Design a protein around this nucleic acid. Structure first.
Ligand SMILES: Nc1nc2c(ncn2[C@H]2C[C@H](O)[C@@H](COP(=O)(O)NP(=O)(O)OP(=O)(O)O)O2)c(=O)[nH]1
Ligand SMILES: [Mg+2]
Ligand SMILES: [Mg+2]
Length: 430
DNA sequence: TTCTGACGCT
DNA sequence: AGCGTCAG
């Protein structure tokens, strides 16, 4: 008991933009605002593949990974914005730039770890300590938490969503004020106050809305964030974990949504995260390996030690294009022209990266898929990246992959290529 | 018929 | 180094 760590040492938040690419397009084009709308890549095949969906369109059942022609069947008035196309491929530049706008605001409050194009973890532990001392013992008003939910409340002894939110918040604050709650619970609450401030700054300065999770570690903060989207933030306390996890499907937890999560369910014969507490650490290590076993044992108790890494900028810069079915590249000339198109986009992005961020990539990774392979990559080869030159890069990439071609004729490529990917990696200060 | 990007294993 | 997993 007294020596058992509870993982309540940090305050961590996860901030994630609401329907991010849609808001970027809605900021630019006011005709799209407050409408069912979606962002697609390409257009010819089935109207384009949807990658982002406004909450209004979600109500009609429109989702990511849906073809726009199918989406239009559920939502006839669906409005569509198309990703920019350059050199015959999708160009995500506008969204990466919007992302930087948001990340730079977040970094004013605390150290952040970019987790994707539209989300970052925040380590608020230090910021909270400072705000606590400033207060002098002052109680925390509900007015400071106008968009916060407390997961698990209200409980015990209104029929509208906002009323339920407030009743939960009141129960929580009443407990802190009394002194019923822990120091950790106070720290989380102050963390939520700062997170309100951060989300207000993002909205004021970019126009974009986001949601957030506040908890003691990255896994819980990420889980919390999704509980009340859009435009809300959720506090998940250590105390809330047993009830929360008791009916939480294992797949909902970050990293368990794939094959490992399926094996946990299958091997142990359980469904919910909370059921993991029955097993000893050694039992879990036996089935899932020393690292996974230790992580699972702690995680199902709400505990996780993964640090928020001080990293705002992506570690790699890459671009890729699929060539599905009949579009598969079947000639040497085709392969070279597309390697050049990818190389040109990469050069432009690398050159900008070097001016903005004082660094240079030193390795070029080339990846391809051959027709008939399920694997995202069939083959990956690296070479030196010594100069930001698209012609040189595309020539080098061709050099490293040319041996894969089995075709007896120099001009033909076999098997035909279904994917090309060029990635710049191994950055060094410049 | 998507286009990324982080990280683990060997 | 090259391959796989995971999350969108
Ligand atoms: N190229 C590409 N971009 C994608 C893909 N999937 C998502 N994106 C892009 C488009 C997304 O806007 C963005 C952020 O990813 P989320 O936060 O997972 N989705 P969102 O913020 O839209 O909604 P909410 O968080 O409120 O549910 O990444 C994809 O498969 N391919
Ligand atoms: Mg998002
Ligand atoms: Mg996201």
């Amino acid at each position: 008991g007294p020596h058992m760590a509870t993982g309540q040492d940090r305050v961590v938040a996860l901030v994630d933009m609401d329907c991010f690419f849609v808001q970027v397009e809605q900021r630019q084009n006011p005709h799209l605002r407050n409408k069912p709308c979606a962002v697609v890549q390409y257009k010819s095949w089935k109207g384009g593949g949807i990658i982002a969906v406004s909450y209004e369109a979600r109500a009609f059942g429109v989702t990511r990974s849906m073809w726009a022609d199918d989406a239009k069947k559920l939502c006839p008035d669906l409005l569509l914005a198309q990703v920019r196309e350059s050199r015959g491929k999708a160009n995500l530049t506008k969204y990466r730039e919007a992302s930087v706008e948001v990340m730079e605001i977040m970094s004013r409050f605390a150290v952040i770890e970019r987790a994707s194009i539209d989300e970052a973890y925040v380590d608020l532990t230090s910021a909270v300590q400072e705000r606590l001392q400033k207060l002098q013992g002052q109680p925390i008003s509900a007015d400071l938490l106008p968009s916060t939910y407390i997961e698990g409340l209200p409980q015990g002894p209104t029929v509208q969503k906002e009323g339920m939110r407030k009743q939960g918040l009141f129960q929580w604050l009443d407990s802190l004020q009394i002194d019923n709650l822990t120091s950790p619970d106070l720290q989380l609450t102050v963390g939520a106050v700062i997170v309100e401030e951060m989300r207000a700054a993002i909205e004021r300065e970019t126009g974009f809305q986001c949601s957030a999770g506040i908890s003691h570690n990255k896994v819980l903060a990420k889980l919390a964030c999704g509980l009340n989207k859009p435009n809300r933030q959720t506090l998940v306390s250590h105390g809330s974990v047993p009830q929360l996890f008791s009916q939480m499907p294992i797949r909902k937890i970050r990293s368990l949504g794939g094959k490992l999560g399926a094996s946990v369910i299958e091997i142990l014969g359980i469904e919910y995260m909370g059921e993991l507490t029955q097993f000893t650490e050694s039992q879990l290590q036996s089935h899932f390996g020393e690292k996974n076993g230790s992580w699972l044992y702690a995680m199902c108790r709400g505990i996780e030690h993964d640090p928020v890494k001080p990293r705002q900028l992506p570690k790699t810069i890459g671009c890729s294009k699929n060539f599905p079915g009949k579009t598969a590249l079947a000639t040497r000339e085709q392969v070279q022209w597309w390697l050049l198109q990818l190389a040109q986009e990469l050069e432009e992005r690398l050159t900008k990266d070097r001016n903005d961020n004082d660094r240079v990539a030193t390795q070029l990774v080339v990846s391809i898929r051959v027709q008939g392979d399920k694997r995202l990559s069939s083959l990956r080869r690296c070479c030196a990246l010594t100069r930001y030159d698209a012609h040189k890069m595309s020539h080098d990439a061709f050099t490293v992959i040319k041996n894969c071609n089995t075709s007896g004729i120099q001009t033909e490529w076999s098997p035909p290529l279904t994917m090309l990917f060029l990635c710049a990696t191994k950055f060094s200060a410049s």
